[PDB]
Amino acid sequence: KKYETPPHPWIKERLDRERVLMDKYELKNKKELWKHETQLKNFRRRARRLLAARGKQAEIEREQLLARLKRLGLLPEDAVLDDVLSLTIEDILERRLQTIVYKKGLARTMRQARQLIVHGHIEVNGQIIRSPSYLVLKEEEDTITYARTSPFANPQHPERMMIEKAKQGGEA
Amino acid sequence: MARMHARKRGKSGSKRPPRTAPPIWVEYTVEEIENLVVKLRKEGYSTAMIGTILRDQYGIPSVKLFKDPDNPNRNLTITRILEKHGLAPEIPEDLMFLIRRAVNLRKHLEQHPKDLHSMRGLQLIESKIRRLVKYYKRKGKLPKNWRYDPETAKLLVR
Amino acid sequence: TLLDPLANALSHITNSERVGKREVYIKPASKLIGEVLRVMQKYGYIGEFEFIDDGRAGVYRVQLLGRINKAGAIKPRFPVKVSEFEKWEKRFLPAFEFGILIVSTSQGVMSHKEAIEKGIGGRLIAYVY
Amino acid sequence: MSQEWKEYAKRVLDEWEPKTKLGMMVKEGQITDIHEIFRRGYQIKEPEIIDVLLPEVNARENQEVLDIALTVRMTDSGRRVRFRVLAAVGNRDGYVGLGIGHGKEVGIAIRKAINYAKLNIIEIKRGCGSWECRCRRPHSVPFAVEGKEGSVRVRLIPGPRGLGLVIGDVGKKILRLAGVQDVWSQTFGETRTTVNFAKAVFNALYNTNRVAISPEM
Amino acid sequence: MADEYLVPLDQYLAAGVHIGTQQKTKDMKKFIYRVRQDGLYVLDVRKTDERLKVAGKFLAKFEPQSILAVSVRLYGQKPVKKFGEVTGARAIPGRFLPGTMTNPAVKNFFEPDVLIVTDPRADHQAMREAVEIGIPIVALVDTENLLSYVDLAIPTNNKGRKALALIYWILAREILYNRGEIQSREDFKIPVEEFEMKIVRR
RNA sequence: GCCCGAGUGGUGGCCACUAUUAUUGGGCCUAAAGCGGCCGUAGCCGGGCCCGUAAGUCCCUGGCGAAAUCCCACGGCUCAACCG
RNA sequence: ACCCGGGUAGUCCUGGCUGUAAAGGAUGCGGGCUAGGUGUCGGGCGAGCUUCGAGCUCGCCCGGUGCCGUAGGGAAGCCGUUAA
């Protein structure tokens, strides 16, 4: 499937973390958080199992899982299957479309950003998108823009004004 | 060390000489030893007691150490000295003494039958024989056609 | 009777250890135990031993450094593939460091770590750590 | 928080009057090294000895109470209730003391326990090495260990970095106070009895050093 | 340590140090000299010379005066009292007044550096607290008394007054030798008699 | 007010928790639970030392256990599911 | 009914059947390993005593039969070289 909920769902320490996270990144539902936890879990689980086994097993398996994390951008230039396990649910959430839109300064604030991509006020590559989950690669970061849009077809959309007053990117 | 069999009682700790080659302050030839053995088997004594009297009189603790090497296939010792001559009983003494005794019991019981305990050792001695039989068959001192019974115990003794 | 004479060696050796005597005496003795103590000494776990072969039996007097924690035989003595090693690695041993899951092998006898470096396996014999 | 650190220790060092020789040498600033109290097995008889080592600032002595129980003894025309409490002193930095205390009133017991716990401090040796490579810090314990307390059987297991403290909450409180980041927890036998389970985890983290290994050599 | 001359060999042997009583146990077997034809065990007299020397050393070492000689014995409390007068520290009680070591609320509270017990069987309490505090422990041990928890020994007789006198005397001499006042090779300034006990009125 | 959210809840079934089925990984004095005791058949399990075989056992090669599903990569569909 | 006075089966012997128990040490059996102390029974050994008999005693050893207790185990009682 594509979710997880820990053995006991109403536990306070688990719930606190989320609600603080919930405002921080401005999710719409908890499921979204979960998506990234459960995605994080799989990398870890596999990274760990690979390092463990006999070193002669086609190393390709390791390479492959270090390649993707580099490309995605979570991993920068570190060479150990142990740094992978040193990610957290915050790092994944930094990697989202939503986050990366606010960061660059295409949006005033993440709550605003939620509006933009839905109505097709953010282009990526040549395509528009509807899904704010969207996993944004490192190579993919450089290609976020406007062309046939309500924010940028002129220089007197109040939209331009709303983004300018803030001008602050960074972790969401 | 012990085995409390039909008992709870730890077994005797009697132990061998840790001598591996024999005393030379004691002195006998392969020929002299062989005579002593043959003389004693001629009396009516049996190999354990033959080894006993030789120990107590002639001062040889076990024959194997003194004798071998004189044909180093294996150790040369009492009954292996006897078999080469033809003085050996085809039944192993082990199995013989056993059965021997057994036939005596039966006669007691014959006259006296109200005996728990005496009945209960009949059962305890047979079942050692059975075993001692069972393995010999496979080793080969007693043919595979045999099987043990109290009429086939009264025939071997007589 | 006895069986697993090795094991009745080892088990003494450990219960010996746990007390903190100085040296050991193992009344029944053998190749298995001899060899195993040999490999054991080779890794270093133990100090020196002398066996005296009495016309009765081999006996091993063994010197105890203090190193050994726990070292035990395997019960049915399972066959273990060289792929299944890792499983039997995680179970019996205390961590990746130690590596004397002593197996018996085509090459001879080895620890776990000396087995892996060659690359060969088989039925388990005992452990040491 | 910086220098305010010693100031609590020195404020304690204004009126602290040593009972022991241990409490004296510490109050003189000598052997200023908790670790150098442990190795030697010199008796922690004074509570303040520790307050001397743990200032406001760096390690942050995380005082914490687990369970508060109400028990009775029946007495002539009376039930005499009291309270037992379990408290945990520890620094995330690799020391810990588990304490329990019994008293008529509540507040007192908390206090008693807090004190009790100090005496029974322990180093937990963490896994420098890790599991896999000694990349940086001691994330785990070195070796898998087990606890034993009445019915309770806790295994601590080395672990992956980030796979953090995977145990029941009660222990999870104690462990965090130790400074084990990552550890697989295999329990066995009734935990309901908190005091023990805790005593388990504590005993366990205690036995760490008691393990004699090869890298020590 | 050093060879048994006289004073050393005539002193122990003249004093009934040798004569031990009933029971042997496996650990003590080493100091035990010989069997009489009665169950009365004799201790080795050499071993007593030897294990008294190192006991001048071991107690010349802890030079600060919080050495405690306690006794549960009626005989022994007099030699002990006199012994303590010379040295410079002693806990007197018929018991230990438990909470001598473990408690500092007690109005009688000391913090020793060494202990001397007389009978491991009677002074078990003084031992009991000697395991907790972390105190090394030197003593007088009999054919009947174990050495469990008892880390350094002086195998001597302790059941009688002559002996109970000789030892806390020769010892008061030995530690004063090491620390450097009056020697164990000079004849002691104090007479033996005070350490010796006598019953006129009870 | 808390949870979750186009779902959420009720009954039923299965698995987990339940080392309450014990290989991993349970017990059996008094908590359930030792047969009232022995014998030996079938079975399982076996002291040391040397030699043969290599049946188990390990190692290597080779024939082979369809596709699908699973796991990993890259690529495709706006995204993913899904597919290549 | 407990208490008292009579009383058959049975209780005894012989042969047979029946097969139960808090049939307990509520503790299956075998081997190896793991402080000790003490009392006791029988066997061995080195001595002293002697009524010249191991008769009275000391100690080591072997086999059995009790009690106490270190390490450990146990939930605790307890168990602890006669293991739980």
Side-chain angles (χ1 to χ4, degrees):
Chain A
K1 201 177 173 192
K2 222 198 204 178
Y3 299 129
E4 175 132 311
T5 305
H8 190 85
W10 310 309
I11 190 162
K12 201 157 203 302
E13 290 305 302
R14 193 247 188 179
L15 285 165
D16 293 339
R17 290 293 310 124
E18 289 188 310
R19 296 162 175 179
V20 170
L21 263 45
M22 207 208 190
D23 177 68
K24 182 159 186 178
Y25 289 82
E26 223 287 75
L27 305 184
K28 275 188 205 335
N29 298 77
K30 288 285 194 81
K31 57 183 269 163
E32 299 157 35
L33 178 137
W34 304 337
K35 291 187 186 185
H36 305 102
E37 193 163 35
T38 216
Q39 185 185 69
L40 166 58
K41 204 69 58 168
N42 279 333
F43 300 137
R44 168 182 305 113
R45 197 191 269 105
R46 197 173 183 264
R48 195 207 64 161
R49 194 264 303 185
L50 293 156
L51 193 274
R54 62 196 181 183
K56 71 178 178 172
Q57 189 154 178
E59 185 88 42
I60 184 156
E61 293 124 36
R62 288 77 150 181
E63 165 169 291
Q64 277 196 169
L65 191 71
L66 291 160
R68 190 81 182 161
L69 294 168
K70 292 158 173 282
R71 184 168 188 177
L72 185 42
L74 288 164
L75 207 53
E77 291 300 325
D78 310 301
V80 210
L81 288 89
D82 216 356
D83 306 75
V84 179
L85 316 161
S86 337
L87 296 169
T88 55
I89 311 152
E90 303 167 73
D91 295 354
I92 313 289
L93 281 162
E94 196 149 303
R95 298 312 316 176
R96 282 182 56 190
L97 181 58
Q98 198 203 357
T99 299
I100 293 164
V101 171
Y102 158 54
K103 182 185 287 154
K104 285 168 82 84
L106 280 84
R108 176 196 264 261
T109 193
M110 53 298 189
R111 187 158 281 248
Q112 185 172 292
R114 290 299 216 124
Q115 186 244 32
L116 295 165
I117 79 283
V118 170
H119 302 150
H121 296 1
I122 300 293
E123 190 182 53
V124 179
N125 305 293
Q127 311 170 351
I128 308 307
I129 68 308
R130 66 178 189 176
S131 179
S133 327
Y134 199 42
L135 303 171
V136 182
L137 317 179
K138 183 175 287 194
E139 65 197 67
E140 194 174 297
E141 294 195 301
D142 314 301
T143 165
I144 311 185
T145 200
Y146 316 104
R148 303 252 257 153
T149 49
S150 317
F152 278 90
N154 279 321
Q156 66 184 333
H157 291 115
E159 311 243 18
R160 297 162 52 262
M161 165 274 189
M162 302 199 211
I163 306 157
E164 285 166 38
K165 194 181 303 312
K167 286 181 167 168
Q168 172 178 119
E171 171 179 40
Chain B
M1 56 141 143
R3 215 175 52 110
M4 302 75 179
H5 172 58
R7 64 175 170 225
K8 289 310 200 176
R9 272 86 237 193
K11 206 169 87 164
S12 184
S14 297
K15 72 252 141 297
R16 263 163 74 103
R19 305 143 184 157
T20 43
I24 187 60
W25 54 75
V26 176
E27 202 194 304
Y28 289 106
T29 322
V30 176
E31 188 201 307
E32 278 201 278
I33 191 157
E34 277 191 79
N35 167 258
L36 297 152
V37 170
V38 164
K39 187 52 170 307
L40 292 181
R41 168 55 88 176
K42 199 173 177 68
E43 303 312 291
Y45 301 124
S46 256
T47 175
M49 281 197 281
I50 292 169
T52 314
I53 294 158
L54 290 177
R55 176 162 44 65
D56 290 295
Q57 306 204 355
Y58 299 98
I60 309 155
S62 196
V63 187
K64 303 161 200 48
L65 307 170
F66 286 72
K67 274 206 82 185
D68 211 55
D70 102 284
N71 190 8
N73 281 92
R74 35 170 48 243
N75 36 37
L76 280 295
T77 175
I78 317 199
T79 207
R80 182 160 189 262
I81 307 165
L82 299 174
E83 173 170 298
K84 198 181 185 186
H85 313 149
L87 302 162
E90 180 147 18
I91 188 164
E93 189 48 57
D94 311 69
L95 201 58
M96 182 129 166
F97 260 144
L98 284 165
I99 286 176
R100 172 54 145 80
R101 285 196 275 179
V103 177
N104 306 291
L105 290 179
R106 286 209 175 82
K107 288 178 290 160
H108 174 81
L109 273 183
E110 184 189 302
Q111 299 153 283
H112 288 291
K114 191 190 156 196
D115 260 282
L116 198 59
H117 220 135
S118 239
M119 195 183 257
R120 188 256 184 179
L122 184 75
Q123 186 82 235
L124 194 61
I125 197 157
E126 175 185 349
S127 114
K128 199 169 271 193
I129 292 157
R130 265 317 295 159
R131 318 215 305 236
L132 277 274
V133 167
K134 187 184 189 183
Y135 179 75
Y136 284 133
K137 287 187 174 187
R138 310 308 191 248
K139 196 156 161 139
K141 301 198 175 189
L142 178 72
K144 297 190 169 197
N145 56 257
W146 195 271
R147 68 105 195 185
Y148 193 57
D149 60 87
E151 297 292 302
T152 215
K154 195 174 75 178
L155 189 66
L156 292 162
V157 173
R158 274 87 177 196
Chain C
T1 175
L2 249 210
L3 60 101
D4 270 356
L6 173 53
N8 319 122
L10 280 172
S11 217
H12 178 189
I13 214 170
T14 189
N15 289 153
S16 218
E17 259 266 0
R18 198 163 172 182
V19 167
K21 246 68 93 288
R22 309 190 304 163
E23 77 297 298
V24 203
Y25 286 112
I26 137 273
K27 299 142 218 92
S30 72
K31 196 198 195 77
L32 288 173
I33 296 155
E35 236 50 35
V36 162
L37 293 177
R38 188 163 182 285
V39 172
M40 187 189 281
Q41 187 199 41
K42 183 166 65 179
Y43 218 93
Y45 275 89
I46 46 170
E48 187 56 46
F49 64 84
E50 187 172 45
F51 68 88
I52 292 80
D53 191 43
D54 208 53
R56 303 209 69 162
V59 51
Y60 279 67
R61 168 195 193 172
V62 187
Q63 187 177 353
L64 291 188
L65 192 162
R67 200 169 167 200
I68 305 161
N69 201 237
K70 196 80 190 63
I74 303 276
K75 187 178 285 190
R77 295 179 171 168
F78 296 105
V80 191
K81 284 187 191 179
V82 175
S83 58
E84 285 283 296
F85 273 10
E86 287 71 272
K87 298 190 191 297
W88 280 74
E89 196 164 40
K90 261 77 176 306
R91 270 264 284 107
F92 274 75
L93 297 165
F96 293 153
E97 320 315 72
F98 281 60
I100 308 187
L101 196 66
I102 178 148
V103 199
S104 313
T105 52
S106 321
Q107 187 44 50
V109 279
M110 294 293 214
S111 303
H112 184 61
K113 201 69 177 172
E114 301 156 351
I116 279 284
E117 71 201 17
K118 182 72 191 177
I120 190 73
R123 305 211 159 166
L124 242 296
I125 190 67
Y127 64 77
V128 184
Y129 50 81
Chain D
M1 292 203 276
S2 295
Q3 292 91 33
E4 191 183 288
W5 101 323
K6 183 177 180 67
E7 203 165 50
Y8 182 53
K10 210 176 197 174
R11 269 169 188 174
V12 176
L13 127 70
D14 292 329
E15 197 176 313
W16 174 228
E17 278 301 328
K19 301 157 122 207
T20 60
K21 283 157 269 45
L22 190 60
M24 183 278 288
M25 295 217 209
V26 178
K27 195 186 156 62
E28 295 299 324
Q30 300 175 112
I31 71 157
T32 183
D33 200 332
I34 209 189
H35 295 263
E36 303 183 21
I37 306 159
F38 292 108
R39 306 199 275 159
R40 291 202 180 85
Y42 273 75
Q43 252 203 290
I44 309 109
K45 215 158 284 97
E46 298 290 43
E48 306 286 58
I49 293 162
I50 293 166
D51 275 358
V52 181
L53 195 279
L54 285 182
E56 176 93 60
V57 174
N58 194 27
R60 292 175 151 267
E61 60 196 354
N62 272 129
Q63 303 152 51
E64 188 262 34
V65 177
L66 290 177
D67 181 278
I68 302 159
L70 81 173
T71 79
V72 177
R73 174 174 173 143
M74 182 81 200
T75 320
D76 177 40
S77 174
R79 294 173 298 151
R80 192 168 65 160
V81 71
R82 284 163 146 275
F83 309 99
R84 174 156 284 211
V85 184
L86 293 87
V89 181
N91 55 341
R92 201 177 320 284
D93 266 34
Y95 279 93
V96 66
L98 166 64
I100 67 172
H102 193 54
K104 189 202 292 298
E105 301 299 296
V106 181
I108 187 168
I110 293 166
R111 192 156 300 284
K112 167 51 69 277
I114 290 160
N115 208 312
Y116 181 92
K118 287 168 182 179
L119 296 314
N120 309 311
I121 179 161
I122 193 73
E123 198 181 343
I124 173 171
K125 184 170 72 285
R126 288 163 285 169
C128 232
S130 321
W131 184 57
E132 188 200 347
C133 202
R134 56 191 198 74
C135 183
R136 275 268 180 171
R137 57 191 169 283
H139 78 282
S140 321
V141 61
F143 265 65
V145 56
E146 191 211 293
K148 328 82 176 168
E149 180 71 14
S151 65
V152 187
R153 272 59 212 141
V154 64
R155 199 78 68 73
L156 302 178
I157 305 165
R161 293 252 274 268
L163 199 178
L165 299 183
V166 299
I167 179 157
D169 67 329
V170 47
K172 191 183 164 186
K173 299 313 302 297
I174 295 158
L175 287 179
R176 169 156 308 279
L177 301 174
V180 187
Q181 283 291 4
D182 296 296
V183 59
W184 281 105
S185 142
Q186 195 78 281
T187 169
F188 184 69
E190 191 178 89
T191 291
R192 287 204 162 97
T193 313
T194 189
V195 176
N196 282 189
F197 184 90
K199 190 150 177 86
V201 68
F202 177 90
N203 284 3
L205 279 61
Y206 169 98
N207 298 295
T208 318
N209 302 291
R210 201 209 70 197
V211 177
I213 206 196
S214 165
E216 178 113 56
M217 208 156 268
Chain E
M1 297 275 291
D3 281 273
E4 70 201 329
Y5 302 139
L6 293 68
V7 203
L9 173 58
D10 172 63
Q11 69 177 296
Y12 293 134
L13 208 292
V17 169
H18 75 319
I19 192 165
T21 53
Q22 295 299 271
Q23 204 168 119
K24 297 196 294 171
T25 182
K26 206 151 280 140
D27 241 303
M28 186 71 185
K29 283 201 204 303
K30 301 156 203 70
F31 315 107
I32 303 183
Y33 201 12
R34 60 171 67 136
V35 180
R36 301 183 171 208
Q37 279 204 142
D38 31 270
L40 274 69
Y41 304 122
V42 187
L43 279 155
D44 208 349
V45 58
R46 167 57 177 256
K47 296 308 298 192
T48 318
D49 162 67
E50 201 197 313
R51 305 271 202 145
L52 211 299
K53 298 284 176 194
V54 176
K57 309 202 285 87
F58 172 74
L59 234 160
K61 196 168 184 163
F62 292 106
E63 188 156 315
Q65 302 169 137
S66 224
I67 166 70
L68 316 165
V70 296
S71 186
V72 182
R73 303 177 173 280
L74 320 180
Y75 312 110
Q77 273 286 90
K78 183 169 175 185
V80 161
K81 199 288 199 180
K82 305 299 169 279
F83 167 66
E85 269 219 69
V86 168
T87 299
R90 193 201 47 248
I92 202 164
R95 313 182 313 172
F96 195 54
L97 191 85
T100 310
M101 297 150 153
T102 44
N103 206 11
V106 176
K107 294 192 158 66
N108 276 259
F109 178 60
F110 279 85
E111 281 297 281
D113 291 65
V114 254
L115 190 48
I116 297 148
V117 290
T118 311
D119 182 38
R121 194 201 55 193
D123 306 75
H124 66 293
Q125 179 70 73
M127 320 189 331
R128 249 187 76 137
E129 292 174 51
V131 179
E132 299 175 47
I133 185 166
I135 200 173
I137 186 164
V138 66
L140 318 179
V141 201
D142 193 54
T143 185
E144 58 144 46
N145 307 129
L146 301 155
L147 312 143
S148 176
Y149 297 122
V150 181
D151 292 292
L152 182 72
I154 318 170
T156 187
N157 187 259
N158 45 47
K159 296 280 176 166
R161 306 132 168 251
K162 289 197 96 273
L164 279 159
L166 172 69
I167 293 283
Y168 281 104
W169 185 87
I170 186 53
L171 271 170
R173 201 159 86 163
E174 173 110 54
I175 59 157
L176 293 168
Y177 184 30
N178 288 114
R179 296 164 175 192
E181 302 104 343
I182 186 77
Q183 315 204 137
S184 186
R185 305 271 191 215
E186 272 292 315
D187 301 305
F188 211 164
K189 63 181 166 61
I190 314 297
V192 182
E193 311 182 350
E194 295 154 10
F195 289 69
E196 304 283 15
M197 198 198 171
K198 192 63 185 170
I199 44 161
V200 183
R201 219 183 35 122
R202 278 304 81 166

